[PDB]
Amino acid sequence: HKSEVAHRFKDLGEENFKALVLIAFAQYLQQCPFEDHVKLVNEVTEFAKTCVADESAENCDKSLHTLFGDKLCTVATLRETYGEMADCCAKQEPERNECFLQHKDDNPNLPRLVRPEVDVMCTAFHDNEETFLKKYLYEIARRHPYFYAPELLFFAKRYKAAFTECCQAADKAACLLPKLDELRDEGKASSAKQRLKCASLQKFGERAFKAWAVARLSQRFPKAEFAEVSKLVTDLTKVHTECCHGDLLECADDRADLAKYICENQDSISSKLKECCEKPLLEKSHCIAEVENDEMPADLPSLAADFVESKDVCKNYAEAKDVFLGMFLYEYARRHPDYSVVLLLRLAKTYETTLEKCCAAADPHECYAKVFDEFKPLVEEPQNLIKQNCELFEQLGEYKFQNALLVRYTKKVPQVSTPTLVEVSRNLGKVGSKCCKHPEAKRMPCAEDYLSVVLNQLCVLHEKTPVSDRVTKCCTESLVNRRPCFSALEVDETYVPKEFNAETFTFHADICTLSEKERQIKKQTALVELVKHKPKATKEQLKAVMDDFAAFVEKCCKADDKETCFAEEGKKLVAASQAAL
Ligand SMILES: CCCCCCCCCCCCCCCC(=O)O
Ligand SMILES: CCCCCCCCCCCCCCCC(=O)O
Ligand SMILES: CCCCCCCCCCCCCCCC(=O)O
Numbered sequence: 410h411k412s413e414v415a416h417r418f419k420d421l422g423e424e425n426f427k428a429l430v431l432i433a434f435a436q437y438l439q440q441c442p443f444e445d446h447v448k449l450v451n452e453v454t455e456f457a458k459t460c461v462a463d464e465s466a467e468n469c470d471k472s473l474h475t476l477f478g479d480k481l482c483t484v485a486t487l488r489e490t491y492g493e494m495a496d497c498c499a500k501q502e503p504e505r506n507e508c509f510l511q512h513k514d515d516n517p518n519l520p521r522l523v524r525p526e527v528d529v530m531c532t533a534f535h536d537n538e539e540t541f542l543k544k545y546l547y548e549i550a551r552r553h554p555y556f557y558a559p560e561l562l563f564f565a566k567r568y569k570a571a572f573t574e575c576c577q578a579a580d581k582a583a584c585l586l587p588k589l590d591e592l593r594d595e596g597k598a599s600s601a602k603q604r605l606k607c608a609s610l611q612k613f614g615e616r617a618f619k620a621w622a623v624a625r626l627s628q629r630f631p632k633a634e635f636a637e638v639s640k641l642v643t644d645l646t647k648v649h650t651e652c653c654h655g656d657l658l659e660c661a662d663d664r665a666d667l668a669k670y671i672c673e674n675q676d677s678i679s680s681k682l683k684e685c686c687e688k689p690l691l692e693k694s695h696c697i698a699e700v701e702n703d704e705m706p707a708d709l710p711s712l713a714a715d716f717v718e719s720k721d722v723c724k725n726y727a728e729a730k731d732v733f734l735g736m737f738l739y740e741y742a743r744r745h746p747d748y749s750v751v752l753l754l755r756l757a758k759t760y761e762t763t764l765e766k767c768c769a770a771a772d773p774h775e776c777y778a779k780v781f782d783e784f785k786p787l788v789e790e791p792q793n794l795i796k797q798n799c800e801l802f803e804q805l806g807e808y809k810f811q812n813a814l815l816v817r818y819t820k821k822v823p824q825v826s827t828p829t830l831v832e833v834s835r836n837l838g839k840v841g842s843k844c845c846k847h848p849e850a851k852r853m854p855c856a857e858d859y860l861s862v863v864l865n866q867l868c869v870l871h872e873k874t875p876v877s878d879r880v881t882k883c884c885t886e887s888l889v890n891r892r893p894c895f896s897a898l899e900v901d902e903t904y905v906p907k908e909f910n911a912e913t914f915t916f917h918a919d920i921c922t923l924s925e926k927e928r929q930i931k932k933q934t935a936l937v938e939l940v941k942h943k944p945k946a947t948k949e950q951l952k953a954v955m956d957d958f959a960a961f962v963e964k965c966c967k968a969d970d971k972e973t974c975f976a977e978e979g980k981k982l983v984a985a986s987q988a989a990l
C-alpha cells in the first residue's frame with residue numbers, strides 16, 4: 410500500500426488504532442506523563458485521517474517505523490529523561506528502530522499499581538470512562554514494554570466489560586473484585602509465558618521448539634496431513650522467533666499472514682475455525698490460537714505398522730531423522746489430545762534414543778521391536794499423579810489440601826522462605842481446584858498449562874535469591890524434565906530444625922477480625938514455621954497440633970475478653986504442643 414498509516418487505520422478502526430498507538434508510545438516512553446502520550450496519540454491519529462482522505466498527502470508514503478521514530482525524536486525532553494535513547498535519533502531508520510528497541514527498560518522503577526476502592530473505580534469509570542480506562546491501559550503498558558500490544562488490548566476490553574457490568578450491581582465489590590483478580594492472574598501468567606518461551610527459543614534452539622509445535626499443532630488439527638502440520642510448524646517458528654525479537658509491526662504482520670493462510674486452507678486444517686476466520690484482522694490470530702482442538706478422525710490405525718513392524722524404519726529414519734521423529738510425534742499427538750505436550754516429547758525422545766541404539770545393532774528390526782512398551786510407564790506417571798492428587802483434593806477442601814501440599818513441600822525444601830512456600834502451596838491448590846473439575850480425558854493438558862506457570866514463577870524467584878541446589882537443577886533443566894525434576898524432590902533428611910521463636914507462635918485477637926483469606930495465610934504461615942521447627946513431626950502429630958490450634962482459635966474468638974484468652978490459652982497451647990513433639 411502507498412500509505413501504511415492509512416491502511417492500518419482503515420483495517421483497525423479509529424478506536425483500536427488510538428489504543429494501539431497509546432500502548433506503543435507507552436512502551437517506548439515509559440517515563441513520560443499520560444497527558445503527553447495522549448497528545449502524541451491525537452497528533453498521530455489526526456495525521457492518519459489526513460492519509461485516509463488522500464494517500465498522496467505529504468509524509469503519508471513514509472513507513473510506519475519512520476513515522477514512529479520521528480514522533481519519538483520529537484519529544485523535547487528525550488535526552489533529559491532517557492539519556493542514551495536520545496542518541497538513537499542520530500541514526501537512519503533501519504538502525505534507529507533497532508536502537509529504540511534495545512533501549513526498552515524491561516524493569517522500570519515504578520511504584521506498584523494500587524488497586525483503588527471499588528467505589529472510587531466505579532465513580533471514575535462512570536464520570537470519565539475513556540480517561541479512566543486509557544490511563545490504566547497506559548499504566549499497564551509502561552510496565553510491560555515487551556508485552557504484545559494487541560493482547561494487552563484484548564485484556565483492556567475485558568476490563569471494560571467488567572466495569573460496565575459490575576458498576577451497576579448492588580454488591581459491586583462482590584462482582585468486580587473476583588473479575589479483577591482473574592484478569593490479574595491471566596495477565597501475569599501470559600506475561601510470564603512469553604518470557605519463558607523466548608528464553609527456551611534462545612537456550613535450546615529452534616529444533617526443540619519445532620518439536621513442541623508439532624505436538625501441539627497435531628493435537629489441535631488432527632485431520633490435517635503431515636505436510637500441512639509441518640508447513641505450519643515452520644511458519645509458527647518464524648513467527649515466534651520474530652516476536653521474541655520485539656518489533657511490534659514485524660510480529661503483527663507475521664501473525665496476520667499465518668492467520669490468513671490458515672483461514673484460506675480451513676478444509677486442509679480444521680473445521681472449528683469457521684467463526685475465528687470471520688473475525689476482524691485484529692482478533693484473527695488470537696482467535697485461531699485459542700480455538701478448541703478439532704475432532705480427531707475416527708478410523709485411525711495404530712502406529713505399529715509405520716514405526717515398528719515396517720522394514721525401512723532405519724532407512725526412513727537415517728534419510729531424514731528429524732522429519733521422521735516429527736512424523737512419529739504427529740501421529741502420536743493427533744491420537745492423544747489427552748496427553749500433555751511434554752509427555753509426547755518424552756515419548757518422541759524415547760523413541761529417538763532407541764532408534765539410535767537399535768539401527769546400529771545386530772538386527773535393528775528385532776532390537777526396536779518392543780519399543781512402545783517403554784512408553785507405558787512414562788504415560789502412567791503423570792496419570793497416577795493426577796488421579797491421586799485430585800482424589801486427595803476431593804477429600805480435603807481446597808484449603809486443607811493447600812495445607813497438605815504445604816507440609817509436603819516444606820519438608821521437601823525447608824530452605825525456601827516461608828511466604829514463598831505459602832504462595833506456591835496456595836497456587837498449587839488453585840490448580841487443583843481448576844483442573845480436577847475436568848474429566849480425565851482433559852486433565853493432563855490443564856495441569857501442564859497451569860504448572861508451567863507456577864513452576865515458572867518459582868524459578869524466577871529462585872534465580873534472584875537461590876537457596877536449593879536441587880531447585881536450581883530443576884529450574885535450569887529442559888522444560889520437558891522441569892515438572893518431573895520437581896516431582897523427584899525428596900524430603901531433606903539433612904535439614905537442621907529451626908530455633909523455636911515464641912513470637913512466631915504467639916497469636917492475638919486481631920486474627921478474629923481478619924478476612925478469611927488473611928486468616929488462612931496467617932495460619933498457613935504458622936504451619937510452615939511449625940514444620941520448619943519440628944521437621945520430623947509425623948502426619949498424626951501434626952494433625953493433633955493443628956486440631957488443638959483450630960479449637961483454640963474458635964475458643965478465643967468466642968470468649969469475652971479475647972486478648973487474655975489468646976495470651977493464656979496461647980501459653981497452654983504452645984507448652985502442650987512442644988511437649989507433644
Ligand atoms: C517437522 C520437523 C520438526 C522436527 C522434529 C524433531 C523431533 C525431535 C524429538 C526429540 C524431542 C525434542 C525435545 C527438545 C529437547 C531436546 O533437544 O532433547
Ligand atoms: C504512526 C503509527 C505509529 C504506530 C502505530 C501503531 C501500530 C499499529 C499496528 C499494530 C496492528 C496489529 C495488527 C493485528 C495483530 C495480529 O494480528 O497479530
Ligand atoms: C503465535 C500465534 C500467532 C498466530 C498464528 C497461530 C495460529 C495457528 C494456531 C496454532 C497456535 C497454537 C498455540 C500457540 C502457538 C505459539 O504461539 O507458540
Ligand SMILES: CCCCCCCCCCCCCCCC(=O)O
Pocket residue numbers: 794818822825829833864867868870871872876880892895896897
Ligand atoms: C524459589 C524456590 C522455590 C522452591 C519451592 C519448593 C516447592 C516445589 C513445588 C513443587 C511443585 C511441583 C509438583 C509436581 C508433582 C509432585 O508434587 O511431585
